[PDB]
Amino acid sequence: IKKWSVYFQNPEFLERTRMFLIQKELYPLVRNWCGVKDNVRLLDVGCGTGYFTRLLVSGDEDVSAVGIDMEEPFIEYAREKAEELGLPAEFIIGDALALPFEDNTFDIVTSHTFLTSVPDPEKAMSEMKRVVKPGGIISSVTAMNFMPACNNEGEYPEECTWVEDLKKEYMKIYTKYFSADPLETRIKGVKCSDVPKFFTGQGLKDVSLYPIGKVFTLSNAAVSDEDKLRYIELFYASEIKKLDAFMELDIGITEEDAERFRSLIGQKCKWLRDHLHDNYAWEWQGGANLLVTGICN
């Protein structure tokens, strides 16, 4: 099995794919539903690059957070991110199955797209229950489906010659990635449909569900330029680093192929940058994540 933070999802990939999951305007609601509130200290388990960690501590409330993850690269990045934004969040390398804390340390315990992944969700939940204070809220956000509920590849202007080639190269190189790094190891946890049942089954009380819609497109007028430009940077960087990591291994990608793929990714990004205000391609994707909370005794 290949190192998660290098070959499967690099730090930039996590940042680019999480950025648009939850509208800015939903943050106070999501904070409230997870039990964020004055003088709350929270733990975010498998925090990756700290996306959800940041979201929860980004309000006006007097809160602090610890994020824990197995991947050194994720923790490094999370620290850099939090430090940059001045946020009260600590990031720590460690194991979900073996939390380096005493019982009843945290008011709130959460995880984001994590219970889906762990080989042993019962034990992880057992840890979350141990470390939360009596009567505190444990929350999980998980994908409702691995497929998007709706999807359009978009229609780019006819001038754009990179569109067909890149589509072709992308699912050629990516099928090669799926060989060398199979997905089935990463999705050993609680099935999407089973999470609510899992919560009451682990003894949690007042089990509550809240859907959280998600949408992606650079054509969206309600998304800031800054966010679009930040996404484009992260997309470029995430694709190039993933490719390079696989080259430095061999998996069946010629150097000509790689330079082609680089060139095309570069052309897409250049087009997206140049058409920041008038991108009407509607390459778009949506669906919903599911928030589940329960109280521990």
Next chain:
Amino acid sequence: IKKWSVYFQNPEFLERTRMFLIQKELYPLVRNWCGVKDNVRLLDVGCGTGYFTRLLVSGDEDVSAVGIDMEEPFIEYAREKAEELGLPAEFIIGDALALPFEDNTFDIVTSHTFLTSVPDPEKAMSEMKRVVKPGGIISSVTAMNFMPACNNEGEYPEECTWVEDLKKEYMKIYTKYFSADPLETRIKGVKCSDVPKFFTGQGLKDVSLYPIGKVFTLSNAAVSDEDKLRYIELFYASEIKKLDAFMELDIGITEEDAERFRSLIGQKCKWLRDHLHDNYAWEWQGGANLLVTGICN
């Protein structure tokens, strides 16, 4: 083609299936995104029983609304509903393709799960553009998928003998309904994935997308008893009225079958009522709807 409000979706069916689409807590956000604001008068096109109409005028803002629909039963019900709740909404029988109003009557024009349905969405949109004031917001909410993104039939206690029989009878009677009333006539409009493209394609500007998550389950601790009890009533009534309408036609349902189906539906409802506080079946379903707005010139 069978009368929509009788054979396809009766007023109670619309109320039961819309009730849980949008969390109460999202109402101010959804109002804002559609351009609801003081001294706004709005039109809701194909308003059905007036679900979305009610949602938009239910805030503190000084707003009023007209709902328009082809179905007399929907309009009747909408009136009864609005009158009961004291809401500033008028409901009118009429045609989306032929709006009984002058140009520039409304500040805002909206529709909910409608652009998906109309045989001629271009003309409907043309009407919406005509009737909205210059620079006003046209909005549409549509399903992201006809399937739910996630799903669990649930695990009812072993004592419940109605569970297996009803599953069996439901998709037996319903396959008979799909024969006598085929679905394909009702879904002649804009494909889910095409709505954003449709908006810019119809000349609308600053086209904006907002996902709206949805979830259903009577096991949810965050849903009020009152809402659960109201859902159960509507479910009972919607199923019985649909069945009766089809009996009064012949479609291949014996009277024994009907009385069986009645009995079972009744037993499910009795169980749901009796287990209002301790339903841990997790019969649940979720996904997201998509809100699209654009400005008219």
